[PDB]
Design a protein around this ligand. Structure first.
Ligand SMILES: CS(=O)(=O)c1ccc(C(=O)Nc2ccc(Cl)c(-c3ccccn3)c2)c(Cl)c1
Ligand SMILES: *[C@@H]1O[C@H](CO)[C@@H](O)[C@H](O)[C@H]1NC(C)=O
Length: 564
């Protein structure tokens, strides 16, 4: 029994302990003092302050070091009218893990590690006392030892893998939607690819070959989206090794599984849009075999660059609702710059080719509509000269035929119309002179020039309009239909980015309030039905482009291979 040092003590009247327990541990000493605790001026009041301090049970790292400190200040050892001052080593041990205390409320003057009221080289009785109460994390926080997993300053607790803003039943509902849409797309797109490889001889040709790689992109995308449906795959792709949600991937000492599924989904998504722009450019140029090298470069290099960029900045995060890893689930700025930015460009570039595509379709359609209008004006006015008996009537119909000839005129075509124009002038002089018989005979000469040379150009014009009937219009229908779905996808990704500033605030507010309790309400969360609309647009194009081989010719392709 050695006598303790003068500086490690403080002269105080020692009153007996009311409670024989401090924060779930027995006390050996009998007397205490309420002067070390500034706020407390009674033992009952000290226990009333200790029960508020015990609210730090959550966050084990702080709770493990604050328990011997709180008992050394509020319920300390008092013997021979002197209270034991707590050692600075016991005090400094809290400064680090209990950094949350300084931030949330701030350390009081009596609980600050100053050389006075906290001296060095002092042996405490609380140091001998062992506390077994620790390791408590309030859900949605899960107990983890990984420092790169601890949510905010709550050292010891990390954010759980399952999204706390959505229920277990709601997850099941979204996963049922992804399974159904994924399987239908997966089977439809594979069928198209199987039909294309079966007739590869004829199939590897523009513009049909474009749709083959389009489907290939939607097939790979389906594999990545359906990957979560393997036993325990969703809680391997989206969940970290400790059980926390995956963030900032590629991260150190963690399975590549997350960035694998991200690369498969995002790359096949982006390459699908570059192949869409190729399809729209093909519909523009239809009105290309030597450009195959240029097509395959941009469709596989540009998405590669964007994917490598995301992996370099490490912005791959995982959502339990989607069941896949993606760019910018946490930091939406990186999502907009890598999802809305390229999808924004494909609507500008791809759309421009669809606009100039219909522009040329209706321009060439108008050319024959105007030339057939002038053909009838010539035919009807010739019947007027035939019907006419007056020299003024013949003169009137020839002047109408002359204006219609010049209107239809605007080298092989120019030479032919000059003969007709010249013949009208030769006929016009006869009408001016008063001759009706000679002018009517001259009009019949225009019929022979029309019936053998001008007729051939009209026949060639009507034939080109019949060329547009099937494939020329089919590619356009698929191009506009795909554009529609891309416009839906853009709107859904934009809606998310728009409200992600408030959804971050509401997610943070719900997790931090549930961290401590002896009700918490979700302010606002992202709309799942809008996410279902996005998946309807994504998988919708997958099935919509799969209908290219939905022709009568493909039925005979499968019948021929059946015999083989
Ligand atoms: C509240 S938060 O943590 O900011 C958060 C949480 C979840 C999301 C979110 O929308 N997740 C999600 C949930 C479900 C789906 Cl299907 C998707 C999706 C849709 C289309 C393409 C790829 N993934 C995405 C977002 Cl943007 C933000
Ligand atoms: C629990 O943590 C919140 C901050 O997330 C804080 O406002 C609250 O005071 C803490 N509870 C206790 C009892 O200290």
């Amino acid at each position: 029994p050695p006598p303790p040092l003068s500086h490690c003590g403080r002269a105080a009247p020692c009153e007996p302990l009311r409670y024989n327990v401090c924060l779930g541990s027995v006390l050996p000493y009998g007397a205490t003092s309420t002067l070390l605790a500034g706020d407390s001026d009674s033992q009952e009041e000290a226990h009333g302050k200790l029960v508020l301090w015990s609210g730090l049970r959550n966050a084990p790292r702080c709770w493990a070091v604050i328990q011997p400190l709180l008992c050394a200040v509020y319920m300390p050892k008092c013997e021979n009218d002197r209270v034991e001052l707590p050692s600075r080593t016991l005090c400094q041990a809290t400064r680090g893990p209990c950094a949350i205390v300084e931030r949330e409320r701030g350390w009081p003057d009596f609980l600050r590690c100053t050389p006075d009221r906290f001296p060095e080289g002092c042996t405490n009785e609380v140091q001998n006392i062992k506390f077994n109460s620790s390791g408590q994390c309030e859900v949605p926080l899960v107990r983890t030892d990984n420092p790169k997993s601890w949510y905010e300053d709550v050292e010891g607790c990390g954010i759980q893998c399952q999204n706390p803003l959505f229920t277990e039943a709601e997850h099941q509902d979204m996963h049922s939607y992804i399974a159904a849409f994924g399987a239908v797309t997966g089977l439809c797109t594979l069928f198209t690819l199987a039909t294309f490889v079966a007739d590869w001889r004829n199939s590897n040709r523009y513009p049909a070959v474009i749709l083959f790689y389009v489907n290939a992109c939607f097939f790979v995308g389906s594999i990545g989206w359906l990957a979560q449906f393997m036993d325990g795959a969703r809680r391997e792709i989206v969940c970290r090794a400790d059980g926390t949600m995956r963030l900032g991937e590629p991260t150190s000492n963690e399975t590549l599984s997350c960035v694998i599924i991200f690369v498969i989904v995002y790359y096949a998504l982006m390459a699908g849009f570059v192949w869409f722009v190729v399809l729209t450019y093909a519909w523009h140029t239809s009105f290309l075999s030597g450009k195959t090298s240029y097509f395959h470069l941009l469709t596989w290099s540009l998405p590669f660059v964007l994917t490598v960029a995301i992996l370099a900045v490490a912005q791959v995060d995982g959502d339990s609702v989607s069941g896949i890893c993606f760019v910018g689930y946490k930091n939406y700025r990186y999502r907009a710059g890598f999802v809305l930015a390229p999808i924004g460009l494909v609507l500008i570039v791809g759309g421009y080719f669809l606009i100039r595509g219909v522009m040329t379709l209706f321009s060439a359609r108008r050319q024959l509509a105007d030339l057939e209008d002038n053909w009838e004006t010539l035919n009807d006015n010739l019947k007027v000269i035939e019907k006419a008996d007056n020299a003024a009537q013949v003169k009137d119909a020839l002047t109408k035929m002359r204006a219609a000839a010049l209107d239809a005129q605007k080298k092989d075509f120019r030479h032919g119309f000059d003969i007709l124009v010249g013949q009208i002038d030769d006929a016009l002089k006869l009408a001016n002179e008063g001759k009706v018989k000679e002018a009517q005979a001259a009009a019949e000469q225009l019929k022979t020039t029309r019936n053998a040379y001008i007729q051939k150009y009209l026949e060639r014009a009507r034939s080109t309009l019949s060329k547009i009937n099937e494939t020329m219009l089919r590619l356009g229908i698929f191009g506009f239909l795909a554009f529609g779905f891309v416009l839906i996808t853009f709107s859904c990704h934009f809606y998310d980015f728009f409200n992600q500033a408030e959804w971050e605030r509401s997610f943070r507010d719900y997790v931090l309030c549930q961290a401590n309790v002896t009700d918490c309400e979700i302010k606002n969360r992202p709309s799942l039905l809008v996410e279902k609309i996005n998946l309807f647009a994504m998988f919708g194009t997958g099935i919509a482009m799969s209908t290219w081989v939905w022709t009568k010719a493909t039925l005979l392709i499968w019948r021929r291979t059946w015999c083989r």
